[PDB]
Design a protein around this ligand. Sequence first.
Ligand SMILES: CS(=O)(=O)Nc1ccc(CN)cc1
Ligand SMILES: CS(=O)(=O)Nc1ccc(CN)cc1
Ligand SMILES: [Zn+2]
Length: 140
Amino acid sequence: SGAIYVGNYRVVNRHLATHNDWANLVWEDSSRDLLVSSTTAQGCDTIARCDCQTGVYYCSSRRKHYPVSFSKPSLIFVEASEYYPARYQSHLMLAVGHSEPGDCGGILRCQHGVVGIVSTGGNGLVGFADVRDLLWLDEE
Ligand SMILES: CS(=O)(=O)Nc1ccc(CN)cc1
Ligand SMILES: CS(=O)(=O)Nc1ccc(CN)cc1
Ligand SMILES: [Zn+2]
């Protein structure tokens, strides 16, 4: 579990969005596994605006943050998980590291701020849904 709180937006994995998220929907994209809903309180996170490929992510299933190198966001085939069938996911970054289903929502961060959230796992990789292209998260 986990979210990004930027401005008056809450960014969550689409597959973990709640009814309240859907009832306050801003934007969602199944191919990216992302959903954004509106919030009443302003959030503490800053979105990275960069093309870093190194950062640190939180792994709930280890209670640890790990430094990783990761691929640039791409269209990637993802094997079946507990929450999606096998399918292509867009805007996905991969690193070598541990990720189970409940790790989804952990933040990946670089020197510029939040890069994305855990979205995929298995076979010794962790996949992160990028948010750095969503420039509108920083205004309105
Ligand atoms: C190929 S992909 O998975 O859609 N990722 C992607 C898409 C668009 C841009 C925007 N410059 C960058 C990366
Ligand atoms: C059958 S599967 O490989 O476990 N993948 C899967 C997981 C969850 C849903 C949603 N109920 C759909 C497909
Ligand atoms: Zn960066």
